[PDB]
Protein backbone atom coordinates (compact mmCIF):
# COMPACT_ATOMS: atom_id res chain seq x y z
CA UNK A 1 0.00 0.00 0.00
CA UNK A 2 1.48 3.27 -1.20
CA UNK A 3 0.34 6.83 -0.58
CA UNK A 4 -0.33 9.27 -3.40
CA UNK A 5 3.00 10.97 -2.70
CA UNK A 6 4.80 7.64 -2.87
CA UNK A 7 3.19 6.78 -6.21
CA UNK A 8 4.24 10.23 -7.46
CA UNK A 9 7.84 9.40 -6.57
CA UNK A 10 7.61 6.01 -8.29
CA UNK A 11 6.33 7.52 -11.49
CA UNK A 12 8.91 10.29 -11.37
CA UNK A 13 11.70 7.70 -11.08
CA UNK A 14 10.07 5.73 -13.89
CA UNK A 15 10.50 8.73 -16.19
CA UNK A 16 14.24 8.13 -15.95
CA UNK A 17 13.73 4.56 -17.14
CA UNK A 18 11.43 5.56 -20.01
CA UNK A 19 14.07 7.89 -21.46
CA UNK A 20 16.23 4.81 -22.23
CA UNK A 21 14.14 1.70 -21.67
CA UNK A 22 16.46 -0.60 -23.62
CA UNK A 23 19.62 0.53 -21.83
CA UNK A 24 17.99 0.20 -18.42
CA UNK A 25 16.48 -3.18 -19.33
CA UNK A 26 19.82 -4.45 -20.61
CA UNK A 27 21.63 -3.45 -17.44
CA UNK A 28 18.93 -4.89 -15.16
CA UNK A 29 19.20 -8.28 -16.85
CA UNK A 30 23.02 -8.21 -16.86
CA UNK A 31 23.02 -7.42 -13.14
CA UNK A 32 20.62 -10.33 -12.53
CA UNK A 33 22.56 -12.83 -14.64
CA UNK A 34 26.03 -11.88 -13.35
CA UNK A 35 24.98 -11.60 -9.72
CA UNK A 36 22.86 -14.77 -9.72
CA UNK A 37 24.09 -17.09 -12.50
CA UNK A 38 21.46 -19.73 -11.72
CA UNK A 39 18.88 -17.30 -13.15
CA UNK A 40 20.49 -17.53 -16.59
CA UNK A 41 19.62 -21.24 -16.68
CA UNK A 42 15.90 -20.41 -16.85
CA UNK A 43 16.37 -18.74 -20.27
CA UNK A 44 16.96 -21.23 -23.05
CA UNK A 45 17.67 -18.30 -25.37
CA UNK A 46 20.36 -16.75 -23.15
CA UNK A 47 22.05 -19.80 -21.59
CA UNK A 48 24.62 -19.69 -24.42
CA UNK A 49 25.95 -16.40 -23.02
CA UNK A 50 29.14 -17.20 -21.14
CA UNK A 51 30.74 -13.78 -20.61
CA UNK A 52 29.33 -10.40 -19.71
CA UNK A 53 30.82 -9.01 -22.94
CA UNK A 54 28.62 -11.47 -24.87
CA UNK A 55 25.68 -10.35 -22.74
CA UNK A 56 26.42 -6.69 -23.53
CA UNK A 57 26.71 -7.44 -27.27
CA UNK A 58 23.45 -9.39 -27.40
CA UNK A 59 20.76 -7.43 -29.19
CA UNK A 60 18.18 -10.04 -28.25
CA UNK A 61 18.99 -9.54 -24.57
CA UNK A 62 18.37 -5.82 -24.96
CA UNK A 63 15.11 -6.66 -26.74
CA UNK A 64 13.99 -8.82 -23.84
CA UNK A 65 14.95 -6.10 -21.39
CA UNK A 66 12.56 -3.81 -23.26
CA UNK A 67 9.76 -6.38 -23.01
CA UNK A 68 10.31 -6.85 -19.25
CA UNK A 69 10.50 -3.18 -18.35
CA UNK A 70 7.57 -2.29 -20.62
CA UNK A 71 5.44 -4.79 -18.74
CA UNK A 72 6.62 -3.55 -15.35
CA UNK A 73 5.96 0.08 -16.29
CA UNK A 74 2.43 -0.77 -17.35
CA UNK A 75 1.86 -2.37 -13.94
CA UNK A 76 3.41 0.53 -12.02
CA UNK A 77 1.28 3.06 -13.86
CA UNK A 78 -1.80 1.33 -12.41
CA UNK A 79 -0.82 2.48 -8.89
CA UNK A 80 -1.69 -0.85 -7.33
CA UNK A 81 -4.85 -1.52 -9.36
CA UNK A 82 -3.03 -4.10 -11.44
CA UNK A 83 -4.98 -7.37 -10.98
CA UNK A 84 -5.67 -7.82 -14.71
CA UNK A 85 -2.09 -6.96 -15.73
CA UNK A 86 -0.42 -9.05 -13.03
CA UNK A 87 -2.49 -12.26 -13.28
CA UNK A 88 -1.12 -13.46 -16.68
CA UNK A 89 2.45 -12.75 -15.60
CA UNK A 90 2.04 -14.64 -12.32
CA UNK A 91 0.51 -17.55 -14.23
CA UNK A 92 3.16 -17.69 -16.95
CA UNK A 93 6.01 -17.33 -14.49
CA UNK A 94 4.71 -20.05 -12.17
CA UNK A 95 3.44 -22.55 -14.72
CA UNK A 96 5.50 -22.12 -17.88
CA UNK A 97 8.78 -20.47 -16.90
CA UNK A 98 8.90 -21.91 -13.35
CA UNK A 99 10.46 -18.82 -11.78
CA UNK A 100 10.71 -19.01 -7.96
CA UNK A 101 9.66 -15.91 -6.05
CA UNK A 102 13.27 -15.60 -4.86
CA UNK A 103 14.29 -14.64 -8.39
CA UNK A 104 11.70 -11.85 -8.35
CA UNK A 105 13.38 -10.58 -5.18
CA UNK A 106 16.73 -10.70 -7.02
CA UNK A 107 15.44 -8.65 -9.95
CA UNK A 108 13.80 -6.15 -7.61
CA UNK A 109 17.10 -5.47 -5.91
CA UNK A 110 18.81 -5.35 -9.32
CA UNK A 111 16.47 -2.55 -10.42
CA UNK A 112 17.49 -0.54 -7.35
CA UNK A 113 21.16 -1.23 -8.06
CA UNK A 114 20.90 -0.12 -11.70
CA UNK A 115 19.06 3.09 -10.82
CA UNK A 116 21.87 4.12 -8.47
CA UNK A 117 24.48 3.10 -11.03
CA UNK A 118 22.96 5.09 -13.90
CA UNK A 119 21.74 8.06 -11.84
CA UNK A 120 24.26 8.46 -9.00
CA UNK A 121 23.22 11.23 -6.67
CA UNK A 122 19.90 11.58 -8.49
CA UNK A 123 18.00 8.65 -6.87
CA UNK A 124 17.21 10.08 -3.46
CA UNK A 125 16.33 8.34 -0.25
CA UNK A 126 12.62 9.09 -0.62
CA UNK A 127 12.62 7.83 -4.22
CA UNK A 128 14.39 4.61 -3.21
CA UNK A 129 11.85 4.09 -0.42
CA UNK A 130 8.88 4.48 -2.72
CA UNK A 131 10.33 2.36 -5.54
CA UNK A 132 11.19 -0.39 -3.07
CA UNK A 133 7.63 -0.37 -1.70
CA UNK A 134 6.20 -0.58 -5.21
CA UNK A 135 8.39 -3.57 -6.10
CA UNK A 136 7.42 -5.22 -2.82
CA UNK A 137 3.73 -4.81 -3.64
CA UNK A 138 4.33 -6.29 -7.09
CA UNK A 139 6.21 -9.24 -5.60
CA UNK A 140 3.63 -9.75 -2.85
CA UNK A 141 0.70 -9.92 -5.25
CA UNK A 142 2.59 -12.39 -7.42
CA UNK A 143 3.33 -14.40 -4.27
CA UNK A 144 -0.38 -14.62 -3.51
CA UNK A 145 -1.00 -16.11 -6.96
CA UNK A 146 1.92 -18.49 -6.50
CA UNK A 147 0.33 -19.75 -3.27
CA UNK A 148 -3.02 -20.30 -5.00
CA UNK A 149 -1.19 -22.43 -7.60
CA UNK A 150 0.90 -24.29 -5.03
CA UNK A 151 4.06 -23.19 -6.80
CA UNK A 152 7.38 -23.09 -4.98
C1 LIG B 1 10.05 -7.36 -13.08
C2 LIG B 1 9.83 -8.66 -13.20
C3 LIG B 1 9.52 -9.32 -14.47
C4 LIG B 1 8.67 -8.93 -15.48
C5 LIG B 1 7.73 -7.74 -15.47
C6 LIG B 1 8.71 -9.97 -16.44
C7 LIG B 1 8.00 -9.90 -17.65
C8 LIG B 1 8.01 -10.85 -18.66
C9 LIG B 1 7.27 -10.81 -19.88
C10 LIG B 1 6.33 -9.70 -20.29
C11 LIG B 1 7.55 -11.95 -20.56
C12 LIG B 1 6.96 -12.38 -21.88
C13 LIG B 1 5.50 -12.86 -21.75
C14 LIG B 1 5.37 -14.02 -20.79
O15 LIG B 1 6.02 -15.07 -21.04
O16 LIG B 1 4.61 -13.90 -19.80
C17 LIG B 1 8.58 -12.62 -19.83
C18 LIG B 1 9.16 -13.80 -20.24
C19 LIG B 1 10.03 -14.52 -19.43
N20 LIG B 1 10.35 -14.26 -18.13
FE21 LIG B 1 9.87 -12.73 -17.09
N22 LIG B 1 9.54 -10.96 -16.04
C23 LIG B 1 10.06 -10.64 -14.85
C24 LIG B 1 11.00 -11.35 -14.10
C25 LIG B 1 11.61 -12.53 -14.51
C26 LIG B 1 12.63 -13.23 -13.82
C27 LIG B 1 13.19 -12.88 -12.46
C28 LIG B 1 12.92 -14.38 -14.56
C29 LIG B 1 13.98 -15.40 -14.38
C30 LIG B 1 14.98 -15.32 -13.53
C31 LIG B 1 12.11 -14.33 -15.72
C32 LIG B 1 12.08 -15.31 -16.67
C33 LIG B 1 11.31 -15.20 -17.83
C34 LIG B 1 11.48 -16.17 -18.93
C35 LIG B 1 12.28 -17.45 -18.84
C36 LIG B 1 10.72 -15.73 -19.95
C37 LIG B 1 10.59 -16.37 -21.31
C38 LIG B 1 11.69 -15.80 -22.22
C39 LIG B 1 11.59 -16.39 -23.61
O40 LIG B 1 12.09 -17.51 -23.82
O41 LIG B 1 11.39 -15.65 -24.58
N42 LIG B 1 11.24 -13.26 -15.60
N43 LIG B 1 8.78 -11.99 -18.62
Domain residue spans in the chain? 1-152
Measured between alpha carbons, how far is residue 3 from residues 7, 123, 134 in Å?
A: 6, 19, 11
Experimental method: X-ray
In whole angstroms, give the CA distance from residue 57 to residue 63.
12
Resolution in A: 1.4
Measured between alpha carbons, how far is residue 71 from residues 12, 17, 75, 149, 150 in Å?
A: 17, 13, 6, 22, 24
| Residues near ligand 1 (Cβ within 6 A) | 39, 42-43, 45, 67-68, 71-72, 89, 92-93, 97, 99, 103-104, 107
For 41, counting Cβ atoms within 10 Å of its Cβ (0-12 exposed, 13-18 middle, 19+ buried), the class is: exposed
Handedness of CA 123, 115, 21, 80 (dihedral sign): negative
Q: Taking the domain 1-152, which CATH number applies?
A: 1.10.490.10
Tell me which residue has its CA closest to atom 35 in ligand 1. Answer: 43
Q: Which residues contact 102 (CB under 8 A, 6 or more apart)?
A: none
Annotated binding site for nitrite: 64
Tell me which residue has its CA closest to atom 9 in ligand 1. Answer: 68
In whole angstroms, give the CA distance from residue 109 to residue 78.
21
Q: CB of 97 within 8 A of CB of 42?
A: yes
DSSP state of 150: T
The pair phi, psi for residue 99, each rounded to 5°, is -100, 110
Quickly count: other Cβ atoms within 10 Å of residue 34's Cβ: 14
3-state SS, residue 31: helix
Amino acid sequence: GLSDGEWQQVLNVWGKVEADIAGHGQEVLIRLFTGHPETLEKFDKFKHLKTEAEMKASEDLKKHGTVVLTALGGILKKKGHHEAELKPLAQSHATKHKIPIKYLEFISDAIIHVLHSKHPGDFGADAQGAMTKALELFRNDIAAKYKELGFQ
